[PDB]
Structure 1
């Protein structure tokens, strides 16, 4: 759950890129592996 008090949103972006990059064989696609980044907004969150 973000924004954390200890990281600004660009530190959130850096920690997220380095956290993607540090997953185990995350860029290996030889066996058919596929990463999927979903980004979304929980539409009408505050209203509903």
Structure 2
């Protein structure tokens, strides 16, 4: 079942843990994705 589910992408990327990242790498990737959002650390116009 897992071989099939990886053959045809039944599980979208957000499903974790994947066979590519250890959980600490998952945390690092989450932090990096949060940081890499376009103008995520903006508070001049009150966005949160």
TM > 0.5 between the two? yes
Misfit runs of 4+, over 2 Å: none
**TM-score, length-scaled by structure 2:** 0.69
Structure (1/2) with the larger helix percentage = 2
Separation in 2, partners of 1:33, 1:4? 32
| RMSD between aligned residues | 0.4
Structure (1/2) with the larger strand percentage = 1
Specify every segment of 5 or more residues in structure 2 that has no aligned partner in the other structure, as ranges.
1-14
Bigger Rg over Cα? 2
**TM-score, length-scaled by structure 1:** 0.69
Number of residue pairs matched? 34
